[PDB]
Amino acid sequence: LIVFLPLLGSSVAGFFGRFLGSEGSAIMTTTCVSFSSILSLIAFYEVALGASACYLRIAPWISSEMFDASWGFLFDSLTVVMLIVVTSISSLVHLYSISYMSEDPHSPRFMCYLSIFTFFMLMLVTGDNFLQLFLGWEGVGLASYLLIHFWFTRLQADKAAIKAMLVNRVGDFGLALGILGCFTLFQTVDFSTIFACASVPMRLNAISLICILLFIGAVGKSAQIGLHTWLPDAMEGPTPVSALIHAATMVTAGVFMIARCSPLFEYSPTALIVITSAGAMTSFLAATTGILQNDLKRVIAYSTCSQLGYMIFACGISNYSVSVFHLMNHAFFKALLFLSAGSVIHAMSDEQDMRKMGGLASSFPLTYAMMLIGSLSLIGFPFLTGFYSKDVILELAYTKYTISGNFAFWLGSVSVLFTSYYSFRLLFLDISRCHDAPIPMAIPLILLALGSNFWANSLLVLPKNEILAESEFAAPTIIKLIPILFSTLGAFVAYNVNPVADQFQRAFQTSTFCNRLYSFFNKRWFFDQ
Amino acid sequence: KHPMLSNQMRHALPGLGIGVAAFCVYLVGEQ
């Protein structure tokens, strides 16, 4: 047993937390009032970070008849990778919770749900065949819900979150219909040779529709623009909770499936172009309509939408490994700035004033100060990103233009304009202490700022597979210079006092003020009403 | 409170001047 550790922690904290006491690990029970905490889950959990590649084998699970027992995973170029990433994320969120928790008496049950979220995400990232994957896949939908309404302060928030979770559910059924069609066609579970099986052969253009149904699932579990289940709701719940959903179960779990099924999107190029179309359109539209949002918390999600649309596009352009490494690094950075958001919301929990353009960027903590680092090294500058995981595949999108022939999308498929614009839209826009980032809160931010090459260089460890021949390409190299200046525009333009072009506030020519997308792109994206 | 707003440009980078000097010292060491 190496994976079920957070499940064990959750199962013990679910009941023993309110009947055990001071220590509750093995002895010293209710010597004082419980004050029990995540302490058990942490002391049991932190070991899994030592995962390193050496052949490991399988273990029984639900021994259905058509299916197989002896489930698990065998070691390849993604298993321990995703394992260490997700356990790092979960440890992050657990420490940040025990910081941000201990005031709401539903805390024990909450962090229980948190580890159940982690365990469903595990059963995703550790399933040998996609049936355990679907187990964990609706597990993380239910877990996103169970994590949404912990704070529970407002009820109509949930009265909207129900129609929200409709979309989590329909995505999980996208996956269910997909896997049903798989076993109607494949008859098997093993991912190795199913590529050879389905690569040769209702509508009778079935297999392509299968892959697209898998895509529909990967997106319906997500929350980006029109499939957004968690945007209008998730921030009333604790900040590391929205961090968890947006990082892991929005996209990471959605795409770890299609990456375990990377050969299954390989065998259908029609499927690949349908992924690329929707991915590029989602990135483009999220970043584009992401104009003038006014808040102090939700703008991280207002970024995540496009910052992951581009990445699902990366998965769909046949650069699955590239999108994977992009997602590890983006999880890191976006989690750093999620925890920055949580720090400043705890600041709002210590006082209720907006500061005068000097305190909107720092209350003078060094522990939290790494918010600038996280943001700017996320934005797509050649520090460790930009050409890395974004612009090299955009140099591939140049050739995608060369193929398709529309000189609109992949020219501006980089959204550094929009990303940089609303980034600063967040960076800008009763006395409290100069010590406002607690230590048990900030140690996670410290180690994850530390977190920021043999994966970023993918054509080395996995060089020149059959059709995985991509990267440098017959490309014009002008993109090694051009989008840096879109980045620089989005960097310096926002340094004014009025970033919005004047007369954008009132609409143009005085038509109906409802036709602007504000009421549209917050509630289910309301595109075709 | 008021000093932090005034010294925001100084605190945008924790040690901008010292870091540039340290980077120059590292360069004069690598060379």
């Binding site: 060094l366 680092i373 050649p382 | 924790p14 040690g15 010292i18 340290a22």
Partner: peptide, 28 residues
């Protein structure tokens, strides 16, 4: 942050500058 920890905690961002210098060395 502890004042003694804060002085050495930042690192002066020198390590970030080294990454920029190495990236610049790779370029051209």
């Amino acid at each position: 942050p502890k004042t003694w920890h804060t002085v050495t905690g930042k690192g002066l961002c020198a390590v970030m500058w080294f990454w920029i210098l190495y990236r610049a060395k790779q370029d051209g």
